[PDB]
Each structure stands twice: as structure tokens, then as C-alpha cells.
């Protein structure tokens, strides 16, 4: 289901307004917002990531904690 | 110091500026910035404000105006 970006961006309701990394960028990087703080979790690899700061690459950090993540490696593409 | 009112002289200071920067040396120099020589920290030749941690999509003049809306450079003081 969450394979679709939108189903993912939806979960970003009440996302910390001042986050240096937009909900959109994360939804795009394949993350889901857990609801607490700025913690999000990859729907494909389940790897969770938080404490985002200026300069971060949503896709970049993603790959760092899960370089072999299915989504990162374009498994769900067209 | 030097005649930094000229873009070319400001650009000379970016000799060892880090290669992989999202914002280019010329874009920064064109915005009145001198390279301090450390990391990606640059400093306005006119208002002396320092700015760093450049990111993809940043506007050199934009951030510059952010920390010094009154910078003489940003305001045309040096115009011909
Ligand atoms: Zn993943
Ligand atoms: Zn200035």
C-alpha cells in the first residue's frame, strides 16, 4: 500500500512545523512519520530515523542506515 | 587589505574552497563574499558577516541579506 508516495505523505499530519527537513522530502525518500518528535520509519526496510538537521539528505541518511533498502535501490519503480 | 570591492579580487580568495560545494565560489564571490579559508565559511568584505553550511538551493545574496539587510554591499553603496 505505502508503496505509493501519497499514502506516505498523509501520515505526516502534525509534523513538527520547524523541521529542517520537510514532510514532503521524507515522504519522497520513502519514510512514514511515526507521530512522535521527528522520527520516521521506512515502509520497505523499517529502518527508523530521527534527529534531522540542516544539511541532511533524506535519501542520503536513508541509504546510510540501510544501504541495501529495497526502496532506495529503486525496486518499486516504473 | 585588498581592493575587494571588485568581484575578481574576492574570487581570488577562493583558491582552496572545497570542491564539492552546493553553492559555487563565483556565486558567493558575486554576492560580496570572501573565502575565510575554513570549511565553507565565507565572510562579506563589506559588512563582515560570516555565513556557512551552504546547501543545495540556497541563494548567496538571499542568506547574505538575511544576516545583514543593511550591508552596504547588498544595498548598492559601491555601485559605479
Ligand atoms: Zn528503507
Ligand atoms: Zn555584507
Short mmCIF file of C-alpha atoms and ligand atoms in Angstrom, two decimals:
data_model
loop_
_atom_site.label_atom_id
_atom_site.label_comp_id
_atom_site.label_asym_id
_atom_site.label_seq_id
_atom_site.Cartn_x
_atom_site.Cartn_y
_atom_site.Cartn_z
CA UNK A 1 0.00 0.00 0.00
CA UNK A 2 2.50 2.60 1.21
CA UNK A 3 4.42 1.86 -1.98
CA UNK A 4 2.59 4.98 -3.15
CA UNK A 5 4.21 8.26 -2.08
CA UNK A 6 0.92 9.96 -1.18
CA UNK A 7 -0.24 7.26 1.24
CA UNK A 8 3.05 8.08 2.89
CA UNK A 9 2.86 11.88 2.91
CA UNK A 10 -0.55 11.56 4.59
CA UNK A 11 0.98 10.08 7.74
CA UNK A 12 2.82 13.38 8.14
CA UNK A 13 -0.05 15.10 9.91
CA UNK A 14 1.11 17.23 12.85
CA UNK A 15 4.74 17.03 11.76
CA UNK A 16 6.96 19.43 13.78
CA UNK A 17 6.47 22.69 11.88
CA UNK A 18 10.06 23.87 12.19
CA UNK A 19 11.70 20.65 10.99
CA UNK A 20 14.73 21.39 8.82
CA UNK A 21 13.56 18.56 6.50
CA UNK A 22 10.05 18.93 5.05
CA UNK A 23 7.48 16.21 5.34
CA UNK A 24 7.48 16.08 1.56
CA UNK A 25 11.19 15.35 1.21
CA UNK A 26 10.87 12.46 3.72
CA UNK A 27 7.69 11.05 2.17
CA UNK A 28 9.60 11.13 -1.09
CA UNK A 29 12.59 9.34 0.48
CA UNK A 30 10.14 6.56 1.36
CA UNK A 31 9.64 7.38 5.04
CA UNK A 32 6.47 7.26 7.18
CA UNK A 33 6.02 9.64 10.12
CA UNK A 34 5.55 7.74 13.42
CA UNK A 35 3.78 10.69 15.06
CA UNK A 36 6.37 11.41 17.74
CA UNK A 37 9.06 14.08 17.55
CA UNK A 38 10.65 13.99 14.10
CA UNK A 39 11.10 10.19 13.99
CA UNK A 40 10.11 8.47 10.77
CA UNK A 41 10.30 4.86 9.54
CA UNK A 42 10.94 3.32 6.13
CA UNK A 43 7.91 1.34 4.93
CA UNK A 44 10.14 -1.06 2.95
CA UNK A 45 13.12 -1.51 5.27
CA UNK A 46 11.51 -0.42 8.58
CA UNK A 47 14.76 1.34 9.44
CA UNK A 48 13.74 4.32 11.62
CA UNK A 49 15.49 7.67 11.53
CA UNK A 50 15.25 10.81 13.65
CA UNK A 51 17.13 13.96 14.76
CA UNK A 52 17.24 15.57 11.35
CA UNK A 53 19.31 18.70 10.95
CA UNK A 54 20.11 21.27 8.33
CA UNK A 55 22.15 19.84 5.51
CA UNK A 56 20.68 16.36 5.73
CA UNK A 57 19.71 14.38 2.65
CA UNK A 58 16.52 12.43 3.37
CA UNK A 59 17.52 9.93 0.72
CA UNK A 60 21.14 10.24 1.84
CA UNK A 61 20.72 9.39 5.50
CA UNK A 62 18.25 6.71 4.47
CA UNK A 63 20.88 4.92 2.42
CA UNK A 64 23.35 5.30 5.32
CA UNK A 65 21.31 3.31 7.83
CA UNK A 66 20.01 0.89 5.17
CA UNK A 67 22.21 0.94 2.02
CA UNK A 68 20.52 -2.23 0.76
CA UNK A 69 17.00 -1.00 1.39
CA UNK A 70 14.62 -2.21 -1.30
CA UNK A 71 13.11 1.24 -1.91
CA UNK A 72 16.47 3.03 -2.06
CA UNK A 73 17.62 0.65 -4.75
CA UNK A 74 14.66 1.57 -6.96
CA UNK A 75 12.86 -1.77 -6.61
CA UNK A 76 9.45 -0.05 -6.65
CA UNK A 77 9.94 1.88 -9.88
CA UNK A 78 8.35 2.15 -13.32
CA UNK B 1 43.75 44.53 2.85
CA UNK B 2 42.96 44.37 -0.87
CA UNK B 3 40.51 46.07 -3.22
CA UNK B 4 37.73 43.64 -2.50
CA UNK B 5 35.07 45.93 -3.97
CA UNK B 6 35.96 44.07 -7.20
CA UNK B 7 34.48 40.63 -7.71
CA UNK B 8 37.69 39.28 -9.27
CA UNK B 9 39.75 40.05 -6.13
CA UNK B 10 37.11 38.45 -3.90
CA UNK B 11 37.22 35.39 -6.16
CA UNK B 12 40.98 35.09 -5.72
CA UNK B 13 40.38 34.20 -2.09
CA UNK B 14 38.52 31.00 -3.01
CA UNK B 15 41.58 29.06 -4.12
CA UNK B 16 41.14 26.23 -1.64
CA UNK B 17 37.41 26.45 -1.21
CA UNK B 18 36.02 22.85 -1.00
CA UNK B 19 35.35 21.37 -4.44
CA UNK B 20 32.00 19.73 -3.77
CA UNK B 21 30.05 22.76 -2.58
CA UNK B 22 26.33 23.05 -3.44
CA UNK B 23 26.91 26.83 -3.87
CA UNK B 24 29.81 27.85 -6.14
CA UNK B 25 32.76 30.07 -5.28
CA UNK B 26 31.78 32.54 -8.01
CA UNK B 27 28.16 32.73 -6.84
CA UNK B 28 29.49 33.53 -3.35
CA UNK B 29 32.09 35.97 -4.53
CA UNK B 30 29.49 37.59 -6.72
CA UNK B 31 27.43 38.09 -3.53
CA UNK B 32 30.25 40.05 -1.85
CA UNK B 33 31.78 37.11 -0.01
CA UNK B 34 35.45 36.31 0.67
CA UNK B 35 36.50 32.74 1.50
CA UNK B 36 37.81 32.62 5.09
CA UNK B 37 39.74 29.51 4.19
CA UNK B 38 38.00 27.25 6.69
CA UNK B 39 35.39 24.72 5.63
CA UNK B 40 32.75 26.53 3.58
CA UNK B 41 32.75 29.58 5.83
CA UNK B 42 32.72 32.83 3.87
CA UNK B 43 32.67 36.40 5.04
CA UNK B 44 31.33 39.62 3.44
CA UNK B 45 34.11 42.03 2.52
CA UNK B 46 31.81 44.96 3.41
CA UNK B 47 29.61 44.07 6.43
CA UNK B 48 31.91 41.29 7.66
CA UNK B 49 29.09 38.85 8.39
CA UNK B 50 30.15 35.21 8.18
CA UNK B 51 27.89 32.52 6.60
CA UNK B 52 28.49 28.79 6.25
CA UNK B 53 26.86 25.41 5.89
CA UNK B 54 25.72 26.13 2.38
CA UNK B 55 23.11 23.83 0.95
CA UNK B 56 21.68 22.96 -2.42
CA UNK B 57 19.09 25.52 -3.40
CA UNK B 58 20.46 28.38 -1.28
CA UNK B 59 20.67 31.91 -2.60
CA UNK B 60 24.03 33.51 -1.75
CA UNK B 61 22.57 37.03 -1.82
CA UNK B 62 19.44 35.81 -0.03
CA UNK B 63 21.17 34.41 3.04
CA UNK B 64 23.57 37.32 2.95
CA UNK B 65 20.66 39.80 3.06
CA UNK B 66 19.21 37.69 5.85
CA UNK B 67 22.04 38.31 8.29
CA UNK B 68 22.77 41.87 7.08
CA UNK B 69 19.72 43.54 5.49
CA UNK B 70 21.72 46.75 5.80
CA UNK B 71 25.05 45.60 4.36
CA UNK B 72 26.40 48.46 2.25
CA UNK B 73 27.28 45.97 -0.44
CA UNK B 74 23.81 44.41 -0.58
CA UNK B 75 22.48 47.94 -0.81
CA UNK B 76 24.40 49.40 -3.75
CA UNK B 77 26.81 51.57 -1.79
CA UNK B 78 29.61 50.52 -4.13
CA UNK B 79 27.69 50.93 -7.37
CA UNK B 80 29.66 52.89 -10.00
ZN1 LIG C 1 14.32 1.75 3.56
ZN1 LIG C 2 27.62 42.15 3.64
#
